[PDB]
Design a protein around this ligand. Structure first.
Ligand SMILES: CCCCCCCCCCCCCCCCCC(=O)OC[C@H](COP(=O)([O-])OCC(O)COP(=O)([O-])OC[C@@H](COC(=O)CCCCCCCCCCCCCCCCC)OC(=O)CCCCCCCCCCCCCCCCC)OC(=O)CCCCCCCCCCCCCCCCC
Ligand SMILES: CCCCCCCCCCCCCCCCCC(=O)OC[C@H](COP(=O)([O-])OCC(O)COP(=O)([O-])OC[C@@H](COC(=O)CCCCCCCCCCCCCCCCC)OC(=O)CCCCCCCCCCCCCCCCC)OC(=O)CCCCCCCCCCCCCCCCC
Ligand SMILES: CCCCCCCCCCCCCCCCCC(=O)OC[C@H](COP(=O)([O-])OCC(O)COP(=O)([O-])OC[C@@H](COC(=O)CCCCCCCCCCCCCCCCC)OC(=O)CCCCCCCCCCCCCCCCC)OC(=O)CCCCCCCCCCCCCCCCC
Ligand SMILES: CCCCCCCCCCCCCCCCCC(=O)OC[C@H](COP(=O)([O-])OCC(O)COP(=O)([O-])OC[C@@H](COC(=O)CCCCCCCCCCCCCCCCC)OC(=O)CCCCCCCCCCCCCCCCC)OC(=O)CCCCCCCCCCCCCCCCC
Ligand SMILES: CCCCCCCCCCCCCCCCC[C@@H](O)O[C@H](CO[C@H](O)CCCCCCCCCCCCCCC)COP(=O)(O)OCC[N+](C)(C)C
Ligand SMILES: CCCCCCCC/C=C\CCCCCCCC(=O)OC[C@H](COP(=O)(O)OCCN)OC(=O)CCCCCCC/C=C\CCCCCCCC
Ligand SMILES: CCCCCCCC/C=C\CCCCCCCC(=O)OC[C@H](COP(=O)(O)OCCN)OC(=O)CCCCCCC/C=C\CCCCCCCC
Ligand SMILES: CCCCCCCC/C=C\CCCCCCCC(=O)O[C@H](COC(=O)CCCCCCC/C=C/CCCCCCCC)COP(=O)(O)OCCN
Ligand SMILES: CCCCCCCCCCCC(=O)SCCNC(=O)CCNC(=O)[C@H](O)C(C)(C)COP(=O)(O)O
Lengths: 122, 347, 115, 98, 88, 175, 140, 49, 54
């Protein structure tokens, strides 16, 4: 079952609709971006170790490129993920607002009027 | 074989898959399957020997039968509704035949016999291609018709695939057959959640493809096709064996590794329906795959097996060819669990 | 109906000729007379033994080249379309592709018979 | 459906069954594959003629083309198997197990 | 599994059966120690036929030397056992 | 009920299919497939599809000639089998004939759902067209539209045929 | 098919034990036939009569197990006057397991089958009572 | 010391090193610019400032 | 005094074509080191023909 495959107004291969520009972009110090940079640094270290080079010192340009590439991809990945979650919430709220019969707000009862069974522990 | 011809055949395989993935007409989808098979047959025979010839013959027979049933299901659907568009598949008999044909193409149990045999009969590069790229087209078609799918048949075949993958993998000393049974079990996991959520199918497919690529590239790096030949790799490249051990742990599904994420999300999705018993059995069965991954880890990384004298000559030389994407594949196979909410971008 | 009658008539005439050929003359069959002919000496092996095909590769190419004939036969009707530029481009595309396949097999010694 | 549709579908089922049960010769199974292709051609042509779908009159030609490709592929594989064993018996393709 | 682990006894029964299947040897007079040349009154050509019968029965060829010196069933049984490395 | 010509042709089609599916010998199987191709040409002709019937007959004649040569080269034995030379082949042939006859009787005397749907018969004349127009053959126009509408189909088909030539050369190379 | 399943499940629990046993025997026979078909396909029996013997052996084993399970389950349900109690299904499952053990002439197989079939049948009864779904329809 | 060329010499491959560093710097400045324009556009659309 | 490590006898358990061998699969052979089986001498007999005297 595909929930969002055919939502009206969806452009086939866009990856970032113009509507997404109305959302605050992720901060450059976002911990998820830092974790992506950590992944890139780990990839650089593993690249050094597999090629039988000094793991920490062998190629600084290669390690920098690894970290930069992972951060660069992660930024747009996070933007798209946040856009999808915003879309989900927007649709949920619109549907609840347009179908009041299926989401009734029934009367609130205080705990002084609700009869709860007591189960002794003994 | 000429490198130009090899590149042309690879592009024809990928062109058939892309034609399957972008078409709206059933005839074009069938044509994509035919083109993919026609280009794939010679790639399996690139290193010519009787075992490769036998593997190619078995693959051709299985896939040609599957495509014949596919075309018959399309024609029945056209007969009962003059529609060529890939949609809800207005006829139930046609849908049953379509499901069986796609299952035959994927290698889901009961039709799973060909996969171990073809994988063992070809080279590690051909096995990499067969077990990674060749799953895309049938899975895409299954995703596009998921609404009209009958849960009872698909779930039966998925559970059978998980069971048979575990049981068959328990008995293997050849690495290619182990990979094939692992592939069968992962296909079962992929198709179990398909009637409920195709995003989970895509996520599981991507994670499995990453782990499989990492495993096959590690096996090509250390030229081992048997357990005993892999038991020598510690005395030549210990880092390779350590990375292989961690990747094998990830394949097993143990947290906090990335392998655990698809199983976790599929279990959650199935419990969002009622569906309680099936995920429990699926996890209990995946314990078998974990067992034989752990046995491989015991043989190759956690203990040291005896070596031979001539390994000293190998110590003096380096690996000439280098796989540029192997470190990224290993990292994605292992350390990706904290980025789980990013799966929302898949739908 | 007329073509079915014609087929029936021709097959009946041939069958009647065979029947007359086999029932009119005097038959004197005995084992030497009916034995296989090999120029007066008995054959060594069987005629049902495998017979090698030196032109096997050309035979497979005939299967593929035969289907392009089915693609080219509707061309007389295709010349009546309004967009003659698209049709003429596609007819030449198919024939150029068919000449390229012949050129490839020719240069790779695919037309030479096995020895 | 009319009787002819059931007859063509029965022919397809018989050819499929024929392919599924192997005797000794590989070539017989290839013939069964070609028979399935012919049955599909006939069925699709009848359906397209009955509904007067003009642009669909060209699909069976495409089907025949890819049937020819499939048959050529099978024949090449048979040539290789026979060159290896001197016989096209499916019993000889038992080097790889499950 | 493959064929059962052939023993000396079965070898002897097969050899004796083949020998009594030979139309020039009377069954009751034949023993495992009978000598073909003297006891059975068999000539050199006859012996060659017996060795060929053994070859057919046990599925392996005996050279001209080797086979020539086997003059009674016990030597044939011993030769077959030694060739097949059968100890029981 | 009109002369039952289409029903007879389809029955002979099924009979030839049973003939080659019993797998007596490749030489005999090719003969059965040739007979099936002929009756299928007839069946399609009786529906207005002259071009398609003639084309499929020609194609299968060429294919069976190649198959005959290949059978003589690689699929022979001392005693080739016919439909009465072997209990397995004869049993399969008789079983197919009896299944066809049972299905025909079952659907002809009753009106029953075999597997997919039901059928009462009446001959395939009923669903015909009574269409009165044209100086052209609609099938011919549809097939000729391959060069103006089916550009994508022409591209993929030509590419696949060229690739098939390359593929057979690669497969039969050996080494 | 589900026709046999409905034929078994339509009859109330502690009523008409003979009909329930007949339906269970039919279900077991169908299962045994399918098992023997797969076994013959994947493991050829080298002779037609041997294949007939293997089919008969498997089918009779399965049919006997089903008959015993149904008979003792219904008998216990009607004797105790306690339908909708999983213990009846547990007793039937253990009886079927002991039948299998007698059929293969093995004590360990008999004991293991008694335990496992009893547990599985009790679980099936609990699932019928509480509405547990083996193949849930998509809901979300 | 080595018996053969060992093609990577004592000096690094300057073309590859320069290309790698240039790619890294280009990607970094592109990301900074993109984030700045994204912030500006978000602030404009919702009318914060 | 030192940690136990696998020896030849331990290592030979994984050297067969299969784990858990049975009577049927005890005769299965592991594949060759390179995936090349030895070529069979399936000699194809040439056709013998009498060219004459007639
Ligand atoms: C959760 C929280 C966060 C945790 C994150 C996850 C864990 C950490 C990240 C993981 C990946 C990172 C490293 C990847 C490359 C490592 C590969 C490697 O071989 O390393 C060797 C390398 C040594 O090589 P060398 O120095 O060139 O010379 C020695 C020779 O090479 C001698 O080498 P040799 O090859 O000759 O020696 C042979 C040896 C060589 O074999 C190995 O070295 C094994 C390494 C495998 C890498 C792990 C696989 C991929 C990552 C998955 C990890 C999963 C974690 C989740 C939990 C599951 C546990 C597995 O093999 C064996 O001896 C066999 C022993 C069998 C044991 C089996 C266990 C292996 C798996 C254990 C993995 C545990 C995690 C990583 C451990 C640390 C590794 C360095 O190690 C290093 O020196 C690098 C490590 C330190 C780098 C980080 C330091 C950062 C800079 C300092 C400043 C910090 C900034 C702070 C900011 C604030 C300002 C002050
Ligand atoms: C509760 C309602 C019903 C439940 C249904 C589900 C339960 C199924 C139970 C059946 C268990 C089958 C496996 C265990 C038997 C072991 C194999 C064997 O031959 O030993 C026989 C063994 C003695 O024979 P043996 O010669 O000593 O065996 C020694 C050899 O080592 C043994 O021979 P071998 O080692 O040389 O190998 C023989 C061969 C034999 O291969 C097989 O047996 C295949 C197993 C398939 C059986 C499952 C069919 C059940 C389907 C039911 C459907 C509804 C029916 C209505 O094994 C293989 O080759 C394994 C290869 C794996 C490939 C898998 C391909 C099978 C297809 C997937 C399963 C079926 C798919 C169906 C549709 C799929 C469409 C998506 O004991 C038996 O005779 C028992 C046979 C049958 C008893 C079944 C019990 C039925 C109880 C029903 C009671 C009703 C209660 C009332 C209801 C309310
Ligand atoms: C649209 C989708 C649908 C499409 C599909 C629909 C298609 C329908 C159209 C069908 C038209 C027919 C067209 C011809 C097909 C071509 C057949 C062929 O070429 O044969 C190749 C094949 C091998 O060729 P070959 O190498 O030259 O000959 C080797 C020797 O024959 C054998 O050498 P051996 O002596 O060394 O081997 C021992 C012997 C031993 O053979 C046996 O062991 C069989 C004995 C089993 C006992 C029968 C059960 C008795 C009671 C069950 C009754 C069920 C209902 C009643 C309930 C219980 C009643 C109380 O044979 C075997 O083991 C081989 C396996 C053959 C067994 C039959 C396979 C069918 C499925 C498996 C059934 C297993 C039976 C278990 C129960 C299942 C339900 C019946 O030949 C055969 O296997 C036998 C001939 C079959 C011809 C007639 C049967 C056709 C069935 C068609 C569908 C029904
Ligand atoms: C966490 C803490 C610890 C927990 C875990 C540890 C504890 C639990 C596990 C350990 C014990 C469990 C093992 C169960 C039995 C294993 C059988 C076995 O291994 O088979 C392979 C093994 C291999 O045999 P084979 O290769 O097939 O053939 C060679 C034979 O050995 C050659 O055989 P043979 O010629 O020597 O003679 C055999 C023959 C005759 O055997 C003899 O020759 C000597 C006579 C011994 C028979 C004993 C029966 C009469 C004595 C019973 C007295 C009352 C019982 C105690 C309760 C008192 C209540 C106040 O036996 C039979 O014919 C069996 C017929 C049935 C009668 C016995 C079964 C009675 C069921 C018990 C009812 C309990 C219900 C609950 C009650 C609640 C109130 C407490 O079989 C045997 O050799 C043993 C045969 C005897 C087994 C039956 C004994 C039953 C023991 C009590 C079972 C209760 C535990 C399970 C409860 C859950 C079930 C739902
Ligand atoms: C094991 C780790 C998995 C990693 C997988 C590979 C990661 C690197 C691959 C880079 C992806 C490049 C693609 C982006 C370029 C533009 C293409 C874009 O237009 O595609 C869009 C699609 O976007 C892509 O799907 C997003 C790809 C991002 C995948 C990453 C998510 C992995 C899950 C969380 C794990 C953490 C990942 C960390 C990465 C380092 C089109 O949307 P649409 O045509 O309408 O959808 C078609 C499918 N539908 C309709 C059936 C739904
Ligand atoms: C395709 C174009 C041509 C079509 C063919 C048409 C040919 C028509 C010509 C008719 C010529 C008459 C046929 C004469 C030859 C008949 C056979 C023959 O000669 O055998 C001689 C034979 C020897 O018999 P015995 O002496 O008893 O036994 C000795 C052996 N122990 O004698 C006979 O049998 C004579 C019987 C008469 C044959 C019938 C001829 C009648 C004409 C039939 C024409 C058919 C057209 C239809
Ligand atoms: C619900 C399922 C209930 C299953 C009932 C049977 C469970 C039996 C398990 C205990 C094992 C019994 C045993 O002792 O082994 C017998 C037997 C093997 O015979 P041997 O013991 O080696 O005979 C030696 C003498 N020559 O063991 C087996 O075959 C067990 C195989 C069946 C296991 C269950 C498979 C179920 C598959 C579907 C899972 C979902
Ligand atoms: C090495 C030893 C470790 C062994 C531990 C294994 C025992 C674990 C206990 C059983 C786990 C399965 C329970 C499933 C998770 C519960 C979630 C739940 O609440 O689901 C129930 C449903 O509950 C179930 O379906 C559970 C059925 C059991 C299926 C699997 C059986 C597993 C084995 C059973 C016996 C063993 C358990 C005890 C073993 C003790 C330790 C040996 C509610 O579903 P609904 O359908 O929505 O309810 C109302 C609508 N009908
Ligand atoms: C189907 C019809 C075809 C038939 C045609 C076959 C052609 C025949 C070819 C003839 C070849 C010879 O003459 S070969 C020469 C034969 N003669 C000798 O060797 C001289 C010494 N004679 C002896 O040793 C004994 O008399 C002896 C009988 C040998 C027993 O041998 P033992 O004492 O060691 O048991």
């Amino acid at each position: 079952m595909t929930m969002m495959s055919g939502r009206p107004g969806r452009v086939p291969l866009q990856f970032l609709p113009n509507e997404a520009r109305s959302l605050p972009p992720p901060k450059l110090t976002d911990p998820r971006l830092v974790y992506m940079g950590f992944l890139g640094y780990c990839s650089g270290l593993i690249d050094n170790a597999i090629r039988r080079r000094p793991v920490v010192s062998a190629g600084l340009h290669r390690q920098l490129l690894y970290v930069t590439s992972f951060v660069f991809f992660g930024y747009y990945l996070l933007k798209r993920q946040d856009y999808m979650y915003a879309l989900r919430d927007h649709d949920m709220f619109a549907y609840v607002k347009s179908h009041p019969e299926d989401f009734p707000e029934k009367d609130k009862k205080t705990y002084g009027e609700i009869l709860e069974e007591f189960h002794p522990v003994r | 074989m000429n490198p130009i011809i090899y590149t042309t055949l690879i592009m024809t395989v990928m062109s058939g898959t892309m034609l399957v993935m972008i078409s709206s007409h059933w005839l074009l989808i069938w044509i994509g399957f035919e083109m993919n098979l026609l280009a794939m047959i010679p790639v399996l025979m690139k290193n010519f020997n009787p075992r490769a010839t036998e593997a190619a013959t078995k693959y051709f027979l299985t896939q040609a039968t599957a495509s014949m049933m596919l075309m018959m299901a399309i024609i029945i659907n056209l007969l009962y509704s003059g529609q060529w568009t890939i949609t809800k598949m207005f006829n139930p008999v046609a849908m049953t035949m379509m499901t069986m044909a796609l299952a035959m193409k994927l290698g889901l149990s009961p039709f799973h016999f060909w996969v171990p045999e073809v994988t063992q009969g070809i080279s590690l590069q051909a096995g990499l291609l067969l077990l990674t790229w060749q799953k895309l087209a049938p899975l895409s078609v299954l995703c596009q018709i998921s609404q009209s799918i009958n849960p009872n048949l698909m779930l039966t075949m998925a559970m059978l695939s998980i069971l048979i993958g575990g049981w068959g993998g328990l008995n293997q000393t050849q690495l290619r057959k182990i990979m094939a049974y692992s592939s069968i079990a992962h296909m079962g996991w992929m198709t179990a959640v398909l009637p409920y959520n195709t995003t989970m199918t895509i996520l599981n497919l991507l994670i499995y493809i990453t782990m499989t690529l990492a495993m096959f590239m590690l096996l090509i790096h250390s030229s081992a096709t048997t357990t005993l030949s892999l038991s020598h790799t510690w005395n030549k490249m210990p880092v390779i064996t350590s990375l292989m051990m961690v990747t094998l742990l990830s394949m097993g599904g143990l947290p906090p590794l990335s392998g655990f994420m698809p199983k976790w999300m599929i279990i959650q999705e199935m419990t969002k329906n009622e569906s309680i018993i099936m995920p429990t059995l699926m996890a209990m069965t995946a314990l078998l795959n974990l067992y034989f991954y752990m046995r491989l880890a015991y043989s190759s990384s956690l203990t040291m097996f005896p070596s031979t004298n001539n390994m000293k000559m190998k110590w003096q030389f380096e690996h000439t060819k280098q796989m540029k994407l192997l470190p990224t594949m290993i990292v994605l196979s292992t350390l990706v669990l904290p980025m789980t909410p990013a799966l929302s971008s898949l739908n | 109906m007329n073509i079915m009658l014609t087929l029936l008539t021709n097959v009946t005439l041939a069958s009647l000729l065979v029947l007359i050929a086999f029932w009119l003359p005097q038959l004197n069959a005995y084992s030497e007379k009916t034995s296989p002919y090999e120029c007066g000496f008995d054959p060594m092996g069987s005629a049902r033994l495998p017979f090698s095909m030196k032109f096997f590769l050309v035979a497979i190419t005939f299967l593929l080249f035969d289907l392009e004939i089915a693609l080219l036969l509707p061309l007389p009707w295709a010349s009546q379309t309004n967009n003659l530029k698209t049709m003429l481009t596609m007819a030449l595309f198919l024939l150029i592709l068919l000449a390229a396949s012949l050129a490839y097999e020719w240069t790779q010694k695919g037309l030479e018979w096995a020895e | 459906m009319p009787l002819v549709y059931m007859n063509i579908i029965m022919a397809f089922a018989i050819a499929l069954a024929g392919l599924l049960m192997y005797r000794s010769h590989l070539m017989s199974s290839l013939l069964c594959l070609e028979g399935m292709m012919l049955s599909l051609f006939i069925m699709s042509t009848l359906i397209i003629l009955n509904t007067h779908f003009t642009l669909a009159n060209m699909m069976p030609i495409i089907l025949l083309v890819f049937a020819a490709c499939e048959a050529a592929l099978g024949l090449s594989l048979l040539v290789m198997v026979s060159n290896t064993y001197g016989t096209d018996y499916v019993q000889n393709l038992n080097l790889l197990q499950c | 599994s493959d064929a059962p682990p052939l023993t000396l006894e079965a070898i002897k029964d097969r050899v004796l059966y083949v020998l009594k299947l030979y139309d020039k040897i009377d069954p009751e007079k034949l023993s495992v120690n009978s000598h073909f040349m003297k006891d059975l009154g068999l000539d050199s050509l006859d012996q060659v036929e017996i060795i060929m019968a053994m070859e057919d029965e046990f599925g392996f060829e005996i050279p001209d030397i080797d086979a020539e010196k086997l003059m009674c069933p016990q030597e044939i049984v011993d030769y077959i056992a030694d060739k097949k490395d059968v100890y029981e | 009920m009109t002369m039952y010509i289409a029903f007879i042709l389809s029955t002979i089609f099924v009979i030839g299919f049973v003939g080659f599916s019993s797998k007596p010998s490749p030489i005999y199987g090719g003969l059965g497939l040739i007979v099936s191709g002929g009756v299928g040409c007839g069946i399609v002709l009786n529906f207005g599809g002259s071009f398609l019937g003639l084309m499929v007959f020609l194609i299968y004649l060429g294919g069976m000639l190649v198959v005959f040569g290949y059978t003589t080269a690689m699929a022979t034995e001392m005693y080739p089998e016919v439909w009465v030379s072997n209990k397995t082949v004869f049993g399969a042939f008789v079983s197919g004939l009896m299944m066809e006859f049972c299905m025909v009787y079952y659907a002809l005397k009753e009106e029953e759902v075999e597997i997919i749907f039901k059928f009462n018969g009446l001959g395939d004349w009923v669903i015909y067209d009574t269409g009165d127009s044209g100086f052209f053959s609609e099938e011919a126009m549809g097939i000729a539209a391959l060069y103006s509408y089916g550009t994508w189909l022409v591209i993929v088909t030509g590419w696949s045929l060229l690739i098939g030539v390359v593929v057979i050369m690669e497969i039969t190379r050996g080494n | 098919a589900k026709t046999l399943l409905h034929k078994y499940s339509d009859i109330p629990e502690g009523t008409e034990c003979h009909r329930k046993a007949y339906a269970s025997t039919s279900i077991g026979g169908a299962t045994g036939l399918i098992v023997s078909a797969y076994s013959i396909a994947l493991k050829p029996p080298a002779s037609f009569l041997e294949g007939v013997a293997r089919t008969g052996r498997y089918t009779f084993t399965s049919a006997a197990i089903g008959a015993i399970f149904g008979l003792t389950s219904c008998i216990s349900a009607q004797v105790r006057e306690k339908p909708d109690d999983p213990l009846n299904y547990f007793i039937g499952g253990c009886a079927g397991g002991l039948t299998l053990g007698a059929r293969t002439r093995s004590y360990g197989i008999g004991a293991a089958a008694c335990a496992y079939m009893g547990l599985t049948a009790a679980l099936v009864k609990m699932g019928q009572l509480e509405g547990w779904q083996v193949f849930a329809e998509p809901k979300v | 010391k080595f018996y053969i060329r060992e093609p990577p010499h004592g000096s690094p491959d300057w073309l590859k090193v320069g290309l790698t560093l240039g790619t890294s710097v280009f990607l970094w400045i592109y990301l900074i610019k993109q984030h700045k324009e994204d912030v500006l556009e978000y602030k404009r659309r919702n009318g914060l400032e | 005094a030192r940690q136990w490590q696998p020896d030849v006898e331990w290592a030979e358990q994984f050297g067969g074509a299969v784990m858990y061998p049975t009577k049927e699969t005890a005769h299965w052979k592991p594949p060759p080191w390179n995936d090349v089986d030895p070529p069979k001498d399936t000699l194809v007999s040439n056709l013998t023909l009498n060219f004459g005297p007639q």
